[model samples]
Target: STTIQYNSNYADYSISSYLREWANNFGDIDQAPAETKDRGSFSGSSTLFSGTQYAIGSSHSNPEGMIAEGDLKYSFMPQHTFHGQIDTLQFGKDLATNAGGPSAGKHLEKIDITFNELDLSGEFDSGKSMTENHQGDMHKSVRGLMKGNPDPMLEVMKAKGINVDTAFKDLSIASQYPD
Candidate 1:
């Protein structure tokens, strides 16, 4: 009996269906001779990348062996909570050369990264409270005018015989109240 077994390592993706489609697209190449180029090959996969997740990929070749790899991670939680993500990629390549092969060791070619920003919200709250306090001080000036003219502007108006008490009763100004 003939039997076929599927590889479960790539089960996270629809590998079987994708293979069917890929085969259909390239049916003509199915009969071609297998090429034996030892340049490189790559494999990558991700695991549960939602609430908290991580993923990785690696590459290798015949000459220098392990060439490159990458890893990424992310997380989300609440209360003393935050959401953040970090992506990092690393690459290695033979810098020096000899007649046989690479003479020098693997050199760090590049590294890519991503991350969240600093929490400036607390500073914003501090600024907002300061602004509110300033607003209240200004509010107190108008309130003092209603009580009596301790306000220098209103005191000046009073000297000019301009009674603002009636006007103050009719007009409303910006006021700050405690939360």
Candidate 2:
């Protein structure tokens, strides 16, 4: 009955049964209309970026993992490579060129460029410790500084980055972001 309830052709609830009867009685075509099918296979691959960072590919990553192609842009969403767009080297340098100005200069100032494949894979050594927890100044561990520590759990965060913390809690506010 879900089909009948959802049937667009039967608009009025009271008359739907009649319409169903009418369709069943008179609807004709020698054969049923063709059903289209999907054409390609789904892909499985993680994205990797320079230094240390990566993202799991999304089904949203690409429809059919085939039909949907990318136009490339930087993203801090997966907060690694901008949504399959720009990488650190490309972002920190090339984007800086296109974005020349005060902000750009400060961003790339004194930064050296190396065109090497560091870790294009979207994975990091999160399992290892970047700093000895709580061992130095208020936030001595560079990793701790990243997490705004004395927030202490900040160490767990240091490996993943602050974005992950916001993201995890964002799950609690799912209704806000919208479908």
Candidate 3:
């Protein structure tokens, strides 16, 4: 007769956790030009590029006398954004350098350009785990009186009046041969 017969399992843990992220891009351009006779002028130059990416990942397996374990959380979540713009205007005019004394001057123009962009990214994760299989026995009434198996506390104490050979023959007749 024993209380709580062995084979027990347990685990414990306390928090300390974290995460953070940031990335950004910018642009600005404005141009307007005015010109007059001897008036011949216009210019241009352009090149552009943009890229982005993201992620959050996790797997598990534990059993047979099961036990598995384990964080705190922190901020400034994560990410950034941009959508673009640009403006340029070139307007000009001319008509003959005195009609042929040194002629050949009639230049006129109007120009414009455009492009678009937007990019942002982020991630964060914190913990939890549990697996339980509590499986469980005791007896032989004193290893069967110390050695002679096949027991029931001796016929359950011979129906409650114990006799085991007159309880050891009165100590075998007063210790016998006493002079």
Candidate 4:
């Protein structure tokens, strides 16, 4: 005589099983406890020269469409110096008033702020050709074997001056700079 047992948690050694677990683990990476494997969201704000900044972003994906989901934020892992902190005082001091020294007329006789505001770096282009690739950067599946992809929406936010530097990835969105 023999007995058959059924357990939902039983592990299978098949390739399909491996890929299923792989996909599940992929979604778990960097995910917060309150967050789900199928979605991510981020929001941020800061003060500037009396100016202010605010942003909100979110992404969602189905198991079969993970390549089309993501979010953005004040990143922690890749670490950025400009994590939306308010340096209004530092900004003020660097502007004109020399609170540290007196009679410092003209400050430096060099071309510090003499340079005109321009995008000499050749970056920061809105709706640039680069973002166009985001539409095809990843596939619906088989992405588990390849290197992780950067969030495409980052460029979208960057162009709008939102600049997301977070773990959020996939087809994310950002809302930034009201003024």
Query: What's the TM-score of each model vs. the native?
Result: 0.13, 0.16, 0.11, 0.17
Residue 149 lDDT (model 3): 25
Comparing candidate 1 with candidate 4, which one achieves the higher TM-score?
Answer: 4
- lDDT, candidate 1, 1-179, per-residue tens: 11112123322223223222322332222232346222222222223322222211111211111122222212112121111321221211232222333322233222111111211011112234443432332223222222222353234334434333532222122111221
lDDT by candidate, in order shown: 0.24, 0.22, 0.15, 0.22
Candidate order by TM-score, highest to lowest?
A: 4, 2, 1, 3
State which candidate has the highest lDDT: 1
Worst 10 residues of 2 by lDDT: 57-66
List the candidate 3 regions with Cα displacement exceeding 4 Å: 1-150, 171-179
Q: Tell me how far the alpha carbon of residue 44 in candidate 1 is from the true structure, in angstroms, after superposition.
A: 26
| TM-score preference between candidates 2 and 4, better one | 4
lDDT of 2 at 155: 40
How many residue pairs clash per model?
A: 0, 8, 0, 0
Candidate 3 clashing pairs, residues 3+ apart or interchain: none
Candidate 4 C-alpha lDDT tens digits along 1-179: 11111122221222223233334433433342445332311222131211122111111122221111112112222221112222110000011212333222112111111111111111222343433322221210112211122233223224534323431121122111121
- Name the lDDT value of residue 170 in candidate 1: 24
Best candidate (score: TM-score)? 4
lDDT for position 150 in model 1: 35
Candidate 2 residue pairs that clash: 47-122, 48-120, 48-121, 48-122, 54-122, 58-61, 75-82, 76-79
Pairs in clash, predicted candidate 4: none
lDDT score, candidate 1, position 50: 24
Residue 88, candidate 2: C-alpha displacement in angstroms: 6.5
Off by over 4 Å in 2: 1-107, 113-115, 123-179
